């Protein structure tokens, strides 16, 4: 859609920040499209990832961090509020102790901070979606 | 790059046909980009898949078919001739008994026919690549 994908934006986060994303999968769920949102420690795509959020639409969500180049403890959820063929609105709120992910207004995933959110310098949104809105509160 | 991704083209295949794809991953291998090539039985994206070829660059290749809407027996290979950050040339040749996948001129994967290649009506190339060339011999 309107915004380029992969989408990369410099960003700063702290308690009270919200990252809001509006988009739509590029394929029906039967084709297992992905969505990925990564909060990076530098502008470079190979930099460490404070928060990795990966949806396989219709299947599961995996969350992790990538520290000194290595993936850490994967977390998995089978919660799937995303609807086949539909636009979604995804909100990621920075709470004192965790990220909270809302999908279409419903609390759907959380992820305890492994690294301070202040380490984030960049957000990348990519894989099999079109993107119409991306916003970071400041 | 030049061709739209996801890329969809109507196609007919038989013994002696070759599908040639030139492209480049959109991310470094550390970010686990995917490439997927699906030979479909109809133009519709949800149609059955005679040959499903999915690369997770730097990790593995999975191959399968999707018959009457259900994924069948997955095959997996850890062969990884693709090079981090590089353009690749992918050739899929239709042999009497199998598909043969060449990567940068080297035989890299094969997949025995589960359904006659004559059932193919469409090829889709998608996931995390840019595409500069797509050709089906006729």
PDB file of C-alpha atoms in Angstrom:
ATOM      1  CA  UNK A   1       0.000   0.000   0.000  1.00  0.00           C
ATOM      2  CA  UNK A   2       1.126   3.538   0.734  1.00  0.00           C
ATOM      3  CA  UNK A   3       4.179   2.950   3.004  1.00  0.00           C
ATOM      4  CA  UNK A   4       7.270   1.070   1.761  1.00  0.00           C
ATOM      5  CA  UNK A   5       7.766  -2.464   3.095  1.00  0.00           C
ATOM      6  CA  UNK A   6      10.266  -3.325   4.584  1.00  0.00           C
ATOM      7  CA  UNK A   7       9.598  -0.189   6.586  1.00  0.00           C
ATOM      8  CA  UNK A   8      12.359   1.285   8.761  1.00  0.00           C
ATOM      9  CA  UNK A   9      12.032   4.289  11.066  1.00  0.00           C
ATOM     10  CA  UNK A  10      14.367   5.712  13.684  1.00  0.00           C
ATOM     11  CA  UNK A  11      12.667   5.620  17.059  1.00  0.00           C
ATOM     12  CA  UNK A  12      13.058   6.273  20.770  1.00  0.00           C
ATOM     13  CA  UNK A  13      10.919   4.465  23.327  1.00  0.00           C
ATOM     14  CA  UNK A  14      10.277   4.744  27.044  1.00  0.00           C
ATOM     15  CA  UNK A  15       7.487   3.868  29.466  1.00  0.00           C
ATOM     16  CA  UNK A  16       4.334   5.330  27.952  1.00  0.00           C
ATOM     17  CA  UNK A  17       5.429   5.123  24.314  1.00  0.00           C
ATOM     18  CA  UNK A  18       3.114   3.417  21.840  1.00  0.00           C
ATOM     19  CA  UNK A  19       3.929   2.080  18.364  1.00  0.00           C
ATOM     20  CA  UNK A  20       0.814   1.890  16.189  1.00  0.00           C
ATOM     21  CA  UNK A  21       0.768  -0.008  12.895  1.00  0.00           C
ATOM     22  CA  UNK A  22      -2.089  -0.369  10.410  1.00  0.00           C
ATOM     23  CA  UNK A  23      -1.722  -2.882   7.618  1.00  0.00           C
ATOM     24  CA  UNK A  24      -3.069  -5.903   5.794  1.00  0.00           C
ATOM     25  CA  UNK A  25      -1.597  -9.332   4.958  1.00  0.00           C
ATOM     26  CA  UNK A  26      -0.585  -9.787   1.323  1.00  0.00           C
ATOM     27  CA  UNK A  27      -1.983 -13.321   1.180  1.00  0.00           C
ATOM     28  CA  UNK A  28      -4.844 -15.384   2.540  1.00  0.00           C
ATOM     29  CA  UNK A  29      -4.110 -17.187   5.791  1.00  0.00           C
ATOM     30  CA  UNK A  30      -3.991 -20.567   4.001  1.00  0.00           C
ATOM     31  CA  UNK A  31      -0.721 -19.342   2.442  1.00  0.00           C
ATOM     32  CA  UNK A  32       0.813 -18.637   5.901  1.00  0.00           C
ATOM     33  CA  UNK A  33       1.879 -15.003   5.379  1.00  0.00           C
ATOM     34  CA  UNK A  34       4.119 -13.466   8.043  1.00  0.00           C
ATOM     35  CA  UNK A  35       4.286 -10.118   9.791  1.00  0.00           C
ATOM     36  CA  UNK A  36       7.398  -9.075  11.678  1.00  0.00           C
ATOM     37  CA  UNK A  37       8.075  -6.064  13.903  1.00  0.00           C
ATOM     38  CA  UNK A  38      11.584  -5.659  15.326  1.00  0.00           C
ATOM     39  CA  UNK A  39      12.764  -3.025  17.825  1.00  0.00           C
ATOM     40  CA  UNK A  40      16.486  -2.613  17.034  1.00  0.00           C
ATOM     41  CA  UNK A  41      19.382  -1.151  19.004  1.00  0.00           C
ATOM     42  CA  UNK A  42      20.867   0.574  15.932  1.00  0.00           C
ATOM     43  CA  UNK A  43      19.716   1.719  12.494  1.00  0.00           C
ATOM     44  CA  UNK A  44      21.552  -1.220  10.895  1.00  0.00           C
ATOM     45  CA  UNK A  45      19.310  -4.204  10.072  1.00  0.00           C
ATOM     46  CA  UNK A  46      21.853  -6.637  11.543  1.00  0.00           C
ATOM     47  CA  UNK A  47      21.856  -4.868  14.909  1.00  0.00           C
ATOM     48  CA  UNK A  48      20.530  -6.464  18.076  1.00  0.00           C
ATOM     49  CA  UNK A  49      16.778  -6.742  18.607  1.00  0.00           C
ATOM     50  CA  UNK A  50      15.293  -5.716  21.951  1.00  0.00           C
ATOM     51  CA  UNK A  51      11.852  -7.007  20.956  1.00  0.00           C
ATOM     52  CA  UNK A  52      11.126  -9.344  18.052  1.00  0.00           C
ATOM     53  CA  UNK A  53       7.438  -9.931  17.235  1.00  0.00           C
ATOM     54  CA  UNK A  54       6.618 -12.363  14.420  1.00  0.00           C
ATOM     55  CA  UNK A  55       3.095 -13.388  13.395  1.00  0.00           C
ATOM     56  CA  UNK A  56       2.475 -16.370  11.168  1.00  0.00           C
ATOM     57  CA  UNK A  57      -1.105 -15.440  10.344  1.00  0.00           C
ATOM     58  CA  UNK A  58      -3.504 -18.225  11.251  1.00  0.00           C
ATOM     59  CA  UNK A  59      -0.807 -20.243  13.060  1.00  0.00           C
ATOM     60  CA  UNK A  60       1.084 -18.624  15.952  1.00  0.00           C
ATOM     61  CA  UNK A  61       3.100 -15.678  17.216  1.00  0.00           C
ATOM     62  CA  UNK A  62       6.728 -15.952  18.278  1.00  0.00           C
ATOM     63  CA  UNK A  63       8.557 -13.362  20.332  1.00  0.00           C
ATOM     64  CA  UNK A  64      12.229 -13.123  21.203  1.00  0.00           C
ATOM     65  CA  UNK A  65      15.248 -10.867  21.492  1.00  0.00           C
ATOM     66  CA  UNK A  66      18.516 -11.008  19.563  1.00  0.00           C
ATOM     67  CA  UNK A  67      21.464 -10.145  21.793  1.00  0.00           C
ATOM     68  CA  UNK A  68      25.066  -9.849  20.580  1.00  0.00           C
ATOM     69  CA  UNK A  69      23.913 -11.459  17.359  1.00  0.00           C
ATOM     70  CA  UNK A  70      22.251 -14.523  18.930  1.00  0.00           C
ATOM     71  CA  UNK A  71      18.564 -15.317  19.294  1.00  0.00           C
ATOM     72  CA  UNK A  72      17.620 -15.835  22.936  1.00  0.00           C
ATOM     73  CA  UNK A  73      14.695 -17.666  24.573  1.00  0.00           C
ATOM     74  CA  UNK A  74      11.799 -17.943  22.135  1.00  0.00           C
ATOM     75  CA  UNK A  75       8.293 -17.337  23.492  1.00  0.00           C
ATOM     76  CA  UNK A  76       5.316 -18.710  21.561  1.00  0.00           C
ATOM     77  CA  UNK A  77       1.595 -17.926  21.599  1.00  0.00           C
ATOM     78  CA  UNK A  78      -1.266 -19.545  19.704  1.00  0.00           C
ATOM     79  CA  UNK A  79      -3.502 -16.511  20.294  1.00  0.00           C
ATOM     80  CA  UNK A  80      -4.692 -15.375  16.845  1.00  0.00           C
ATOM     81  CA  UNK A  81      -6.988 -12.331  16.907  1.00  0.00           C
ATOM     82  CA  UNK A  82      -6.021 -11.416  13.339  1.00  0.00           C
ATOM     83  CA  UNK A  83      -8.796 -12.120  10.832  1.00  0.00           C
ATOM     84  CA  UNK A  84      -8.264 -13.739   7.421  1.00  0.00           C
ATOM     85  CA  UNK A  85      -8.217 -11.182   4.611  1.00  0.00           C
ATOM     86  CA  UNK A  86      -8.729  -8.186   6.902  1.00  0.00           C
ATOM     87  CA  UNK A  87      -6.872  -4.993   7.681  1.00  0.00           C
ATOM     88  CA  UNK A  88      -5.495  -4.998  11.224  1.00  0.00           C
ATOM     89  CA  UNK A  89      -4.475  -2.326  13.707  1.00  0.00           C
ATOM     90  CA  UNK A  90      -1.549  -3.315  15.908  1.00  0.00           C
ATOM     91  CA  UNK A  91      -0.533  -1.309  18.980  1.00  0.00           C
ATOM     92  CA  UNK A  92       2.627  -1.981  21.006  1.00  0.00           C
ATOM     93  CA  UNK A  93       2.687  -0.115  24.315  1.00  0.00           C
ATOM     94  CA  UNK A  94       5.772   0.252  26.496  1.00  0.00           C
ATOM     95  CA  UNK A  95       4.803  -0.527  30.100  1.00  0.00           C
ATOM     96  CA  UNK A  96       7.204  -0.348  33.053  1.00  0.00           C
ATOM     97  CA  UNK A  97       7.887  -4.088  32.976  1.00  0.00           C
ATOM     98  CA  UNK A  98       6.778  -5.300  29.549  1.00  0.00           C
ATOM     99  CA  UNK A  99       5.504  -4.557  26.084  1.00  0.00           C
ATOM    100  CA  UNK A 100       1.765  -4.949  25.627  1.00  0.00           C
ATOM    101  CA  UNK A 101       0.505  -5.789  22.130  1.00  0.00           C
ATOM    102  CA  UNK A 102      -3.085  -4.869  21.268  1.00  0.00           C
ATOM    103  CA  UNK A 103      -4.681  -6.185  18.080  1.00  0.00           C
ATOM    104  CA  UNK A 104      -7.803  -4.379  16.893  1.00  0.00           C
ATOM    105  CA  UNK A 105      -8.212  -2.939  20.388  1.00  0.00           C
ATOM    106  CA  UNK A 106      -7.826  -6.229  22.279  1.00  0.00           C
ATOM    107  CA  UNK A 107      -4.897  -7.082  24.539  1.00  0.00           C
ATOM    108  CA  UNK A 108      -3.310 -10.064  22.823  1.00  0.00           C
ATOM    109  CA  UNK A 109       0.376 -10.537  23.763  1.00  0.00           C
ATOM    110  CA  UNK A 110       2.871  -9.336  26.363  1.00  0.00           C
ATOM    111  CA  UNK A 111       6.657  -9.593  26.554  1.00  0.00           C
ATOM    112  CA  UNK A 112       8.707  -8.743  29.642  1.00  0.00           C
ATOM    113  CA  UNK A 113      11.597  -6.351  29.068  1.00  0.00           C
ATOM    114  CA  UNK A 114      14.906  -8.148  28.683  1.00  0.00           C
ATOM    115  CA  UNK A 115      16.712  -4.913  27.825  1.00  0.00           C
ATOM    116  CA  UNK A 116      15.639  -1.387  28.722  1.00  0.00           C
ATOM    117  CA  UNK A 117      13.378   0.085  25.998  1.00  0.00           C
ATOM    118  CA  UNK A 118      15.703   3.107  26.011  1.00  0.00           C
ATOM    119  CA  UNK A 119      18.156   0.924  24.056  1.00  0.00           C
ATOM    120  CA  UNK A 120      15.858   1.020  21.014  1.00  0.00           C
ATOM    121  CA  UNK A 121      16.947   3.261  18.144  1.00  0.00           C
ATOM    122  CA  UNK A 122      14.992   1.841  15.209  1.00  0.00           C
ATOM    123  CA  UNK A 123      11.799  -0.061  14.400  1.00  0.00           C
ATOM    124  CA  UNK A 124      11.477  -2.267  11.319  1.00  0.00           C
ATOM    125  CA  UNK A 125       8.155  -3.631  10.031  1.00  0.00           C
ATOM    126  CA  UNK A 126       8.430  -6.244   7.305  1.00  0.00           C
ATOM    127  CA  UNK A 127       7.413  -9.599   5.739  1.00  0.00           C
ATOM    128  CA  UNK A 128       4.140 -10.235   3.937  1.00  0.00           C
ATOM    129  CA  UNK A 129       2.035  -7.148   4.613  1.00  0.00           C
ATOM    130  CA  UNK A 130       1.058  -3.854   3.126  1.00  0.00           C
ATOM    131  CA  UNK A 131       1.303  -0.919   5.516  1.00  0.00           C
ATOM    132  CA  UNK A 132      -0.852   2.207   5.581  1.00  0.00           C
ATOM    133  CA  UNK A 133       0.028   3.724   8.976  1.00  0.00           C
ATOM    134  CA  UNK A 134       3.033   3.730  11.287  1.00  0.00           C
ATOM    135  CA  UNK A 135       3.278   6.010  14.310  1.00  0.00           C
ATOM    136  CA  UNK A 136       5.430   6.296  17.436  1.00  0.00           C
ATOM    137  CA  UNK A 137       4.168   8.503  20.238  1.00  0.00           C
ATOM    138  CA  UNK A 138       6.728  10.902  21.680  1.00  0.00           C
TER     139      UNK A 138
ATOM    140  CA  UNK B   1      13.373  -4.224  -7.778  1.00  0.00           C
ATOM    141  CA  UNK B   2      11.813  -4.140 -11.226  1.00  0.00           C
ATOM    142  CA  UNK B   3       9.164  -6.921 -10.972  1.00  0.00           C
ATOM    143  CA  UNK B   4       6.273  -6.716  -8.475  1.00  0.00           C
ATOM    144  CA  UNK B   5       6.475  -9.012  -5.442  1.00  0.00           C
ATOM    145  CA  UNK B   6       4.322 -11.041  -4.767  1.00  0.00           C
ATOM    146  CA  UNK B   7       4.729 -11.997  -8.401  1.00  0.00           C
ATOM    147  CA  UNK B   8       2.042 -14.088 -10.114  1.00  0.00           C
ATOM    148  CA  UNK B   9       2.169 -15.420 -13.672  1.00  0.00           C
ATOM    149  CA  UNK B  10      -0.043 -17.881 -15.513  1.00  0.00           C
ATOM    150  CA  UNK B  11       2.025 -20.856 -16.590  1.00  0.00           C
ATOM    151  CA  UNK B  12       1.964 -24.268 -18.235  1.00  0.00           C
ATOM    152  CA  UNK B  13       4.631 -26.861 -17.495  1.00  0.00           C
ATOM    153  CA  UNK B  14       5.641 -30.223 -18.904  1.00  0.00           C
ATOM    154  CA  UNK B  15       8.790 -32.338 -19.085  1.00  0.00           C
ATOM    155  CA  UNK B  16      11.490 -30.025 -20.399  1.00  0.00           C
ATOM    156  CA  UNK B  17      10.033 -26.788 -19.030  1.00  0.00           C
ATOM    157  CA  UNK B  18      12.283 -24.544 -16.959  1.00  0.00           C
ATOM    158  CA  UNK B  19      11.290 -21.723 -14.595  1.00  0.00           C
ATOM    159  CA  UNK B  20      14.130 -19.232 -14.142  1.00  0.00           C
ATOM    160  CA  UNK B  21      14.088 -16.605 -11.395  1.00  0.00           C
ATOM    161  CA  UNK B  22      16.665 -13.905 -10.661  1.00  0.00           C
ATOM    162  CA  UNK B  23      16.369 -11.983  -7.427  1.00  0.00           C
ATOM    163  CA  UNK B  24      17.943 -10.859  -4.182  1.00  0.00           C
ATOM    164  CA  UNK B  25      16.924 -11.213  -0.513  1.00  0.00           C
ATOM    165  CA  UNK B  26      15.586  -8.033   1.081  1.00  0.00           C
ATOM    166  CA  UNK B  27      17.479  -8.636   4.323  1.00  0.00           C
ATOM    167  CA  UNK B  28      20.756 -10.051   5.567  1.00  0.00           C
ATOM    168  CA  UNK B  29      20.680 -13.740   6.430  1.00  0.00           C
ATOM    169  CA  UNK B  30      20.874 -12.967  10.172  1.00  0.00           C
ATOM    170  CA  UNK B  31      17.300 -11.652   9.829  1.00  0.00           C
ATOM    171  CA  UNK B  32      16.080 -14.984   8.337  1.00  0.00           C
ATOM    172  CA  UNK B  33      14.422 -13.670   5.153  1.00  0.00           C
ATOM    173  CA  UNK B  34      12.293 -16.129   3.180  1.00  0.00           C
ATOM    174  CA  UNK B  35      11.818 -16.914  -0.488  1.00  0.00           C
ATOM    175  CA  UNK B  36       8.819 -18.901  -1.668  1.00  0.00           C
ATOM    176  CA  UNK B  37       7.950 -20.308  -5.094  1.00  0.00           C
ATOM    177  CA  UNK B  38       4.606 -22.084  -5.489  1.00  0.00           C
ATOM    178  CA  UNK B  39       3.331 -23.930  -8.579  1.00  0.00           C
ATOM    179  CA  UNK B  40      -0.475 -23.632  -8.319  1.00  0.00           C
ATOM    180  CA  UNK B  41      -3.317 -25.552  -9.947  1.00  0.00           C
ATOM    181  CA  UNK B  42      -5.387 -22.391 -10.534  1.00  0.00           C
ATOM    182  CA  UNK B  43      -4.822 -18.639 -10.764  1.00  0.00           C
ATOM    183  CA  UNK B  44      -6.360 -18.190  -7.300  1.00  0.00           C
ATOM    184  CA  UNK B  45      -3.799 -17.871  -4.481  1.00  0.00           C
ATOM    185  CA  UNK B  46      -5.758 -20.313  -2.301  1.00  0.00           C
ATOM    186  CA  UNK B  47      -5.647 -23.036  -4.952  1.00  0.00           C
ATOM    187  CA  UNK B  48      -3.741 -26.276  -4.497  1.00  0.00           C
ATOM    188  CA  UNK B  49       0.044 -26.286  -4.813  1.00  0.00           C
ATOM    189  CA  UNK B  50       1.728 -28.963  -6.920  1.00  0.00           C
ATOM    190  CA  UNK B  51       5.189 -27.842  -5.798  1.00  0.00           C
ATOM    191  CA  UNK B  52       5.926 -25.600  -2.822  1.00  0.00           C
ATOM    192  CA  UNK B  53       9.543 -24.421  -2.449  1.00  0.00           C
ATOM    193  CA  UNK B  54      10.398 -22.276   0.580  1.00  0.00           C
ATOM    194  CA  UNK B  55      13.895 -21.041   1.449  1.00  0.00           C
ATOM    195  CA  UNK B  56      14.704 -19.634   4.855  1.00  0.00           C
ATOM    196  CA  UNK B  57      17.983 -18.055   3.800  1.00  0.00           C
ATOM    197  CA  UNK B  58      20.866 -19.304   5.914  1.00  0.00           C
ATOM    198  CA  UNK B  59      18.730 -21.978   7.619  1.00  0.00           C
ATOM    199  CA  UNK B  60      16.956 -24.579   5.463  1.00  0.00           C
ATOM    200  CA  UNK B  61      14.674 -25.293   2.527  1.00  0.00           C
ATOM    201  CA  UNK B  62      11.274 -26.928   2.895  1.00  0.00           C
ATOM    202  CA  UNK B  63       9.319 -28.461   0.049  1.00  0.00           C
ATOM    203  CA  UNK B  64       5.776 -29.783  -0.011  1.00  0.00           C
ATOM    204  CA  UNK B  65       2.503 -29.909  -1.895  1.00  0.00           C
ATOM    205  CA  UNK B  66      -0.905 -28.609  -0.834  1.00  0.00           C
ATOM    206  CA  UNK B  67      -3.676 -30.945  -1.961  1.00  0.00           C
ATOM    207  CA  UNK B  68      -7.396 -30.260  -1.483  1.00  0.00           C
ATOM    208  CA  UNK B  69      -6.385 -27.456   0.844  1.00  0.00           C
ATOM    209  CA  UNK B  70      -4.108 -29.523   3.116  1.00  0.00           C
ATOM    210  CA  UNK B  71      -0.327 -29.523   3.346  1.00  0.00           C
ATOM    211  CA  UNK B  72       1.093 -32.982   2.683  1.00  0.00           C
ATOM    212  CA  UNK B  73       4.430 -34.587   3.619  1.00  0.00           C
ATOM    213  CA  UNK B  74       7.037 -31.904   4.255  1.00  0.00           C
ATOM    214  CA  UNK B  75      10.542 -32.498   2.889  1.00  0.00           C
ATOM    215  CA  UNK B  76      13.453 -30.579   4.412  1.00  0.00           C
ATOM    216  CA  UNK B  77      16.991 -29.838   3.231  1.00  0.00           C
ATOM    217  CA  UNK B  78      19.831 -28.038   4.990  1.00  0.00           C
ATOM    218  CA  UNK B  79      21.633 -27.440   1.682  1.00  0.00           C
ATOM    219  CA  UNK B  80      22.235 -23.673   1.458  1.00  0.00           C
ATOM    220  CA  UNK B  81      24.033 -22.563  -1.715  1.00  0.00           C
ATOM    221  CA  UNK B  82      22.539 -19.071  -1.448  1.00  0.00           C
ATOM    222  CA  UNK B  83      25.085 -16.454  -0.373  1.00  0.00           C
ATOM    223  CA  UNK B  84      24.420 -13.728   2.209  1.00  0.00           C
ATOM    224  CA  UNK B  85      23.665 -10.374   0.591  1.00  0.00           C
ATOM    225  CA  UNK B  86      23.973 -11.667  -2.975  1.00  0.00           C
ATOM    226  CA  UNK B  87      21.753 -11.830  -6.024  1.00  0.00           C
ATOM    227  CA  UNK B  88      20.806 -15.409  -6.883  1.00  0.00           C
ATOM    228  CA  UNK B  89      19.681 -17.205 -10.021  1.00  0.00           C
ATOM    229  CA  UNK B  90      17.209 -20.009  -9.382  1.00  0.00           C
ATOM    230  CA  UNK B  91      16.256 -22.544 -12.058  1.00  0.00           C
ATOM    231  CA  UNK B  92      13.487 -25.132 -11.642  1.00  0.00           C
ATOM    232  CA  UNK B  93      13.521 -27.785 -14.362  1.00  0.00           C
ATOM    233  CA  UNK B  94      10.685 -30.229 -14.988  1.00  0.00           C
ATOM    234  CA  UNK B  95      12.165 -33.718 -15.394  1.00  0.00           C
ATOM    235  CA  UNK B  96      10.117 -36.842 -16.142  1.00  0.00           C
ATOM    236  CA  UNK B  97      10.006 -37.882 -12.485  1.00  0.00           C
ATOM    237  CA  UNK B  98      10.889 -34.782 -10.473  1.00  0.00           C
ATOM    238  CA  UNK B  99      11.632 -31.093 -10.326  1.00  0.00           C
ATOM    239  CA  UNK B 100      15.310 -30.195 -10.248  1.00  0.00           C
ATOM    240  CA  UNK B 101      16.277 -26.905  -8.586  1.00  0.00           C
ATOM    241  CA  UNK B 102      19.564 -25.291  -9.621  1.00  0.00           C
ATOM    242  CA  UNK B 103      20.968 -22.372  -7.634  1.00  0.00           C
ATOM    243  CA  UNK B 104      23.624 -20.282  -9.365  1.00  0.00           C
ATOM    244  CA  UNK B 105      24.204 -23.155 -11.788  1.00  0.00           C
ATOM    245  CA  UNK B 106      24.540 -25.898  -9.160  1.00  0.00           C
ATOM    246  CA  UNK B 107      22.051 -28.722  -8.665  1.00  0.00           C
ATOM    247  CA  UNK B 108      20.751 -28.136  -5.155  1.00  0.00           C
ATOM    248  CA  UNK B 109      17.311 -29.718  -4.556  1.00  0.00           C
ATOM    249  CA  UNK B 110      14.975 -32.246  -6.163  1.00  0.00           C
ATOM    250  CA  UNK B 111      11.320 -33.072  -5.541  1.00  0.00           C
ATOM    251  CA  UNK B 112       9.529 -36.092  -7.005  1.00  0.00           C
ATOM    252  CA  UNK B 113       6.263 -35.340  -8.786  1.00  0.00           C
ATOM    253  CA  UNK B 114       3.243 -35.961  -6.589  1.00  0.00           C
ATOM    254  CA  UNK B 115       0.881 -34.548  -9.213  1.00  0.00           C
ATOM    255  CA  UNK B 116       1.501 -34.287 -12.946  1.00  0.00           C
ATOM    256  CA  UNK B 117       3.186 -30.956 -13.819  1.00  0.00           C
ATOM    257  CA  UNK B 118       0.446 -30.507 -16.432  1.00  0.00           C
ATOM    258  CA  UNK B 119      -1.854 -29.610 -13.514  1.00  0.00           C
ATOM    259  CA  UNK B 120       0.042 -26.343 -12.991  1.00  0.00           C
ATOM    260  CA  UNK B 121      -1.695 -23.175 -14.172  1.00  0.00           C
ATOM    261  CA  UNK B 122       0.106 -20.469 -12.200  1.00  0.00           C
ATOM    262  CA  UNK B 123       3.438 -19.728 -10.522  1.00  0.00           C
ATOM    263  CA  UNK B 124       3.739 -17.344  -7.574  1.00  0.00           C
ATOM    264  CA  UNK B 125       7.061 -15.981  -6.285  1.00  0.00           C
ATOM    265  CA  UNK B 126       6.878 -14.135  -2.983  1.00  0.00           C
ATOM    266  CA  UNK B 127       8.208 -13.396   0.541  1.00  0.00           C
ATOM    267  CA  UNK B 128      11.313 -11.357   1.292  1.00  0.00           C
ATOM    268  CA  UNK B 129      12.987 -10.847  -2.077  1.00  0.00           C
ATOM    269  CA  UNK B 130      13.276  -8.397  -4.893  1.00  0.00           C
ATOM    270  CA  UNK B 131      12.861  -9.915  -8.343  1.00  0.00           C
ATOM    271  CA  UNK B 132      14.509  -8.807 -11.581  1.00  0.00           C
ATOM    272  CA  UNK B 133      13.801 -11.760 -13.900  1.00  0.00           C
ATOM    273  CA  UNK B 134      11.113 -14.412 -14.229  1.00  0.00           C
ATOM    274  CA  UNK B 135      10.871 -16.709 -17.238  1.00  0.00           C
ATOM    275  CA  UNK B 136       9.070 -19.932 -18.166  1.00  0.00           C
ATOM    276  CA  UNK B 137      10.293 -21.809 -21.215  1.00  0.00           C
ATOM    277  CA  UNK B 138       7.579 -22.922 -23.619  1.00  0.00           C
TER     278      UNK B 138
END
